[PDB]
Design an enzyme around this catalytic site. Sequence first.
Site, PDB file in Angstrom:
ATOM      1  N   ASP A 180      -5.904   0.059  -4.493  1.00 52.56           N
ATOM      2  CA  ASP A 180      -4.836  -0.030  -3.460  1.00 52.56           C
ATOM      3  C   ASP A 180      -4.119   1.322  -3.356  1.00 52.56           C
ATOM      4  O   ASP A 180      -4.544   2.127  -2.505  1.00 52.56           O
ATOM      5  CB  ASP A 180      -3.860  -1.170  -3.762  1.00 52.56           C
ATOM      6  CG  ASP A 180      -3.321  -1.849  -2.515  1.00 52.56           C
ATOM      7  OD1 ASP A 180      -3.899  -1.630  -1.432  1.00 52.56           O
ATOM      8  OD2 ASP A 180      -2.327  -2.592  -2.636  1.00 52.56           O
ATOM      9  N   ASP A 194       3.186  -9.383  -3.433  1.00 51.69           N
ATOM     10  CA  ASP A 194       3.527  -8.416  -4.469  1.00 51.69           C
ATOM     11  C   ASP A 194       4.234  -9.062  -5.649  1.00 51.69           C
ATOM     12  O   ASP A 194       4.217  -8.500  -6.747  1.00 51.69           O
ATOM     13  CB  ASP A 194       4.425  -7.313  -3.902  1.00 51.69           C
ATOM     14  CG  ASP A 194       3.693  -6.387  -2.957  1.00 51.69           C
ATOM     15  OD1 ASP A 194       2.468  -6.217  -3.115  1.00 51.69           O
ATOM     16  OD2 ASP A 194       4.350  -5.817  -2.062  1.00 51.69           O
TER      17      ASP A 194
END
Lengths: 96, 667, 243, 208
Positions: free
Chosen positions: D124, D126
């Site tokens: 990458d 939450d």
Amino acid sequence: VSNEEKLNLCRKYYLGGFAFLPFLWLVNIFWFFREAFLVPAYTEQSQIKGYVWRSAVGFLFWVIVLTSWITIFQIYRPRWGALGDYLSFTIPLGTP
Amino acid sequence: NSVERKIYIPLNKTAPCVRLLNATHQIGCQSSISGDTGVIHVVEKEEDLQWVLTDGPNPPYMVLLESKHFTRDLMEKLKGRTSRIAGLAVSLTKPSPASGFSPSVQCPNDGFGVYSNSYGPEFAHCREIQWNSLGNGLAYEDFSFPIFLLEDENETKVIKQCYQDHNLSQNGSAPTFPLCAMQLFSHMHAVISTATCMRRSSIQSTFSINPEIVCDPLSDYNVWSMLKPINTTGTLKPDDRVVVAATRLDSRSFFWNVAPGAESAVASFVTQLAAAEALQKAPDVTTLPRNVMFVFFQGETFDYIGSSRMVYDMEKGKFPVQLENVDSFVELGQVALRTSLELWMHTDPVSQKNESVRNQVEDLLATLEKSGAGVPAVILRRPNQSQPLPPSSLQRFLRARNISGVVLADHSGAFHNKYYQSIYDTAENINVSYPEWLSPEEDLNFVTDTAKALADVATVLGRALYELAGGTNFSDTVQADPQTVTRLLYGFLIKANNSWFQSILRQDLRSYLGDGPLQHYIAVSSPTNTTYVVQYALANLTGTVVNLTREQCQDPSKVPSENKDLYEYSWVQGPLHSNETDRLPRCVRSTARLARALSPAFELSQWSSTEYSTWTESRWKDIRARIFLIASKELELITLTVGFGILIFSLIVTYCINAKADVLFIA
Amino acid sequence: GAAVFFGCTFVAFGPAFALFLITVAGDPLRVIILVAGAFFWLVSLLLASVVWFILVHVTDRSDARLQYGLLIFGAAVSVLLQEVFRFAYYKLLKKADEGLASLSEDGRSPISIRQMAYVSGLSFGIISGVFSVINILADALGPGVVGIHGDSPYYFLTSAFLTAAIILLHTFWGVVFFDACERRRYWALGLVVGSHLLTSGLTFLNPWYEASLLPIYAVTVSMGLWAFITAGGSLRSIQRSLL
Amino acid sequence: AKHVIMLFVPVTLCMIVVVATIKSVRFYTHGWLIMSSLMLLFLFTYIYLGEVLKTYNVAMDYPTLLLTVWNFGAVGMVCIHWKGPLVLQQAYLIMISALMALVFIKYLPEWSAWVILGAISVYDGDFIFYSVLVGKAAATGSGDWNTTLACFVAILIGLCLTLLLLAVFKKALPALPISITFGLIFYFSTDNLVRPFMDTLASHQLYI
Ligand SMILES: *[C@@H]1O[C@H](CO)[C@@H](O[C@@H]2O[C@H](CO)[C@@H](O[C@@H]3O[C@H](CO[C@@H]4O[C@H](CO)[C@@H](O)[C@H](O)[C@@H]4O)[C@@H](O)[C@H](O[C@@H]4O[C@H](CO)[C@@H](O)[C@H](O)[C@@H]4O)[C@@H]3O)[C@H](O)[C@H]2NC(C)=O)[C@H](O)[C@H]1NC(C)=O
Ligand SMILES: *[C@@H]1O[C@H](CO)[C@@H](O[C@@H]2O[C@H](CO)[C@@H](O)[C@H](O)[C@H]2NC(C)=O)[C@H](O)[C@H]1NC(C)=O
Ligand SMILES: *[C@@H]1O[C@H](CO)[C@@H](O[C@@H]2O[C@H](CO)[C@@H](O)[C@H](O)[C@H]2NC(C)=O)[C@H](O)[C@H]1NC(C)=O
Ligand SMILES: *[C@@H]1O[C@H](CO)[C@@H](O[C@@H]2O[C@H](CO)[C@@H](O)[C@H](O)[C@H]2NC(C)=O)[C@H](O)[C@H]1NC(C)=O
Ligand SMILES: *[C@@H]1O[C@H](CO)[C@@H](O[C@@H]2O[C@H](CO)[C@@H](O)[C@H](O)[C@H]2NC(C)=O)[C@H](O)[C@H]1NC(C)=O
Ligand SMILES: *[C@@H]1O[C@H](CO)[C@@H](O[C@@H]2O[C@H](CO)[C@@H](O)[C@H](O)[C@H]2NC(C)=O)[C@H](O)[C@H]1NC(C)=O
Ligand SMILES: CC(C)CCC[C@@H](C)[C@H]1CC[C@H]2[C@@H]3CC=C4C[C@@H](O)CC[C@]4(C)[C@H]3CC[C@]12C
Ligand SMILES: CC(C)CCC[C@@H](C)[C@H]1CC[C@H]2[C@@H]3CC=C4C[C@@H](O)CC[C@]4(C)[C@H]3CC[C@]12C
Ligand SMILES: CC(C)CCC[C@@H](C)[C@H]1CC[C@H]2[C@@H]3CC=C4C[C@@H](O)CC[C@]4(C)[C@H]3CC[C@]12C
Ligand SMILES: *[C@@H]1O[C@H](CO)[C@@H](O)[C@H](O)[C@H]1NC(C)=O
Ligand SMILES: *[C@@H]1O[C@H](CO)[C@@H](O)[C@H](O)[C@H]1NC(C)=O
Ligand SMILES: *[C@@H]1O[C@H](CO)[C@@H](O)[C@H](O)[C@H]1NC(C)=O
Ligand SMILES: *[C@@H]1O[C@H](CO)[C@@H](O)[C@H](O)[C@H]1NC(C)=O
Ligand SMILES: *[C@@H]1O[C@H](CO)[C@@H](O)[C@H](O)[C@H]1NC(C)=O
Ligand SMILES: *[C@@H]1O[C@H](CO)[C@@H](O)[C@H](O)[C@H]1NC(C)=O
């Protein structure tokens, strides 16, 4: 949010509580209080003024039933036989 | 953490009081969850219980007893006052109680024998003879507080020294409130009975994920062998005759895993293993007209687990020796003491009302006395008063068949054992004690007088079995030796990690041989230490070695000889070849099989049954104990008052300063 | 018991929860200042524990007296690293003063430097008190007190008062440190770090509870009075503020 | 300003529910979005409420916990996928993240969790990640709250530096790895490195 969407809210939102959902009625009577019992600025309040009256006696109806089941189970748990044990989800270990 | 090292001291050598359960009752002890905390108060006279029962300022105490005061009346006075006692610790006594101590009942295994109101009504609840005459019934009482045993003396000195440091009361006044305390954790997960507990553990094991099992059947294995090998995959013919020799294999006590069992268990199967190896050395043993089965029942304390199981499997066709085949039955009771070289021969009087069975038993006793006349150290006697049979494994076979049986024992009336099912039933009970200037390797091979007495008992038993199988020519050859007897006695009763117990087991099982002596409690752990040790010791004493590679020893199917059906094989360790670590492993061509010992109430699943020994054990988690100091309630109220005072003061001062943040601060 | 736990928690986190609840929790900008200050304190403690790890694995653990001298030196260098990263956090508040306020803001002061000093000192106080008392508070839930091996029974309460004193001292130290940094009075810069050394050095006398806790509150009263006069108030400011 | 605090109170109350579960329970030692939430609002509630009652050893029955899961999952379903209050919309995302956090700490092995997080950040919503990351620090080792609360603060600085980076780099931000880089380091920087230096100070009862 207009009064039409609020009336479309709090009729289906009350109608959902007949599927055994008293927490829905709890947040209903917790949520439309200062917007239905504080400011008198609505002609379309009389449905909303009546529904929380219809929802207050509906929720506390369950508060009688639920604690009158909880106490009548917890007191009469060992005095009943295995009938008081097949429908027990958790069972405490050392105590009967 | 390093702060709990400044607060607590663990206790490392402890033995708890574990709850077991019956069909209608429960026995044992239980704490609460998260322990029972109490002030330590030692007891060194019966006058000191004024301070606990009546004159205690700090009510939930925790008494510390020498084990010579752990009586019945003291337990009645503590069980009748439980709001002031939460706990008990018991320190062991080295000059053992000369009054004797037996926590079992006055008449063991009462409702599971043969004698009923329908069969033996005058002998029924042992009205004629109380067998365990000293038994105070204490190990079958339920208790509401922990009772731990202190196996060490130094832990006892630590606890008594902390008592002397803190908990004393001077000049008839109060103890100073920093006081010492002790906390005992044994929260047993079980309740009223085994029906309740088995059902409650069956629902959690079925109707949900994470099965929260709370109880456990006491189960183990019955080790048994033959003199001549049999097929083990079918049954025998209806005209084959075996002669069963039998002996219990376990014991218990008041406390959980302390089951020393010297006089009640160990001496009996030691002399039967000696009888086995004496009989196996007969020069004409293949052509005997009958066969001989040795069997070592386990579970016999808890209402005949293995014996009732062997009977039930023997009549449900699942055992290769059927109940038609049993000619005679020579049980072996307690044989260790033998107060005047006498050995009593107990028979059943009620089944001798049948005349032919009575003649077979008279022929049996004539055979016993003929085989025992050749030994000048054993005097066979029979009881003059026609009295019942002692609690033994023949009282399960006689519930089925009326086999001609006898129970050998060293007592005519009550037990000579002063410590039946007690913690004191150790090697010093049977005068088994070695001199102090010897290495513990020569202690394995040193000969005691008890070994020489049990060798004569085993000689009588082996010649009796040889004559009962119709041996009739080589009777003087049958003789045990004191060497195997003293090695087995040192192995079970003193130190289990021998140089001889290591050379008879497989490589996998050497964890079972700990430092001390073997304890003889039938645990839920389904093969026990003692079961394996007796199995492989019988496998040495009867079996022979063969040349096989280990892969051939795992499966002898490829060999044209060495049948898999008749015998059974094991790759055991060897002896130590010196100067290195060289075991010399080898196969043994033996017959020491195992059979399942788990009572048929747990196979028919009728957990409220009145003839199949519904005994289970509670399951628990983290038995531990520790001591510490406690502080006054004055100091707890003061520290909470100071907490509230500082919190309220800080909130008031911050709210006053923040509200006047304009005036008090200029640029 | 729980009575001792909630008693000793309110002694330690009495003033700190009071200042965090009343003062800082209303102003949503100051929480970022709080977390940044606690972060730089953690980096300070890590950098000191590296050095102590080095010395304890170089000197090879043999003589216990030399390990005690190394423990003293490690505590001293931890104090020095805290008083270096307080200056570092001062410079970061000065850099983020202009780069956010009065250049991305019209009004030149959403928060003054004084309130930033206050919240930075409170941040150091909160994180140091949390690392000092929480492991001791986890043992107050037990049924037993300290003193089986000849220690004092008053361990919990004394550690609670020491934690509260350390919190209030960090709060006052931050204010007086930044006001010393602005006016470039470098002598007061030495007095703050010297008083920090003394308050963390008197904790070596520590089982002697009589005269090892009274001087710490003497230094705390002195530091509170000098932080009060340094902030702007005076006795005339108090005697004319009761309207 | 106000909006960073709108990112603290979510991720803080998520951690207080996780840590008070780890330190108390001691057991964890209209397409796809409907089906994956019905087995999360009704099945994970049935486990989490089931396991939290096994700790305190009370007896709740089937006429209540079937009612309570039905009053929780179905109200949680009609709050998100229909119109509800924002407060109750906010309060339900905290609970579903913790339930998805607690199933990872039990099922994943010893130190594979130190690999998954890393790989994810490198390549990458939450909330789950942060929750799992902490709870791993809330159980491993001895009972030491220093590692749990160091990794508490080390996440929020990665959270603050993300929005400091977003106020200059406007377009898009991964947000995760800044809280992860400071989080992965400051576990292994205080569990084995500061925990010695604290416990010697705690031995002689010392203070810094
Ligand atoms: C499961 O395991 C438990 C634990 O042992 C078993 O519980 C035992 O069951 C025995 C059944 O026979 C009980 O024995 C009877 O107990 C009666 C109660 O007596 C009380 O006890 C005190 C003790 O001193 C006495 O002083 C008082 O009298 C009390 O009443 C006795 O009355 C009884 O004795 C009888 O006497 C009559 C007199 O005519 C005789 O005719 C009769 O044959 C009998 O001898 C007898 O002693 C035993 O108390 C009990 N144990 C405990 C601790 O309670 C369960 O039976 C087991 N469950 C099974 C096998 O299914
Ligand atoms: C039971 O064993 C424990 C170790 O598990 C003993 O605790 C140690 O005791 C020594 C001497 O008192 C200390 O130096 C150690 O720090 C202790 N270790 C710990 C607390 O982890 C304990 O002393 C033993 N019990 C008794 C009664 O002696
Ligand atoms: C074992 O022997 C006894 C003694 O004979 C048998 O008991 C007799 O059985 C008959 C018929 O069953 C009945 O007259 C009485 O029950 C007993 N007779 C008496 C007491 O005179 C018993 O049946 C035999 N078998 C078993 C399996 O025990
Ligand atoms: C019976 O066997 C068990 C298992 O082989 C023995 O338990 C081991 O005991 C040692 C000594 O404390 C421990 O180090 C092992 O961890 C134990 N293992 C297991 C699986 O519990 C036990 O000691 C044996 N009993 C006797 C009397 O020797
Ligand atoms: C049983 O005794 C043997 C022999 O003393 C033990 O075997 C030795 O154990 C020591 C220490 O554990 C090792 O250093 C040796 O290598 C072992 N082998 C030898 C001397 O051949 C064995 O550990 C004991 N078993 C138990 C359970 O205590
Ligand atoms: C049972 O164990 C004994 C241990 O002594 C074995 O006896 C030893 O056997 C070897 C070779 O088999 C001889 O060299 C020794 O002299 C024997 N020692 C004695 C008799 O003290 C015996 O072989 C084992 N038996 C089986 C069937 O395994
Ligand atoms: C650690 C503690 C004990 C140190 C104490 C140091 C004392 C004696 C010193 C340190 C700095 C000093 C202050 C510095 C500046 C001023 C402002 C001036 O207009 C009046 C005196 C006053 C207010 C001083 C008073 C005395 C003072 C507070
Ligand atoms: C534990 C035994 C064996 C050794 C004890 C050593 C003691 C007496 C020594 C070692 C550390 C020393 C302290 C180290 C630093 C300071 C700070 C200084 O501003 C005043 C003296 C003071 C406070 C010292 C006092 C004496 C002290 C406490
Ligand atoms: C046993 C007697 C004769 C001698 C030892 C007494 C000790 C244990 C006592 C006497 C004086 C006490 C102190 C008196 C005052 C304070 C200040 C307070 O804010 C914290 C506790 C503290 C620091 C006390 C701790 C305990 C203490 C040091
Ligand atoms: C008990 O303490 C004595 C005295 O130190 C010691 O010699 C002995 O070995 C100890 N025994 C045990 C079993 O701890
Ligand atoms: C009995 O022994 C024979 C060997 O003679 C064998 O073939 C058979 O499989 C055995 N088992 C039975 C009949 O169950
Ligand atoms: C006696 O026992 C034998 C063999 O068990 C049996 O055949 C006979 O019928 C029995 N007699 C009586 C009267 O029970
Ligand atoms: C044998 O037993 C007796 C009594 O049981 C005992 O006095 C004696 O010490 C024992 N040992 C020897 C060697 O006689
Ligand atoms: C010993 O007696 C048995 C009994 O039948 C007999 O078979 C055997 O042949 C006898 N021994 C010798 C050597 O003859
Ligand atoms: C014993 O077995 C080994 C290996 O199987 C073989 O080589 C040897 O010939 C055998 N000896 C005898 C006497 O059978």
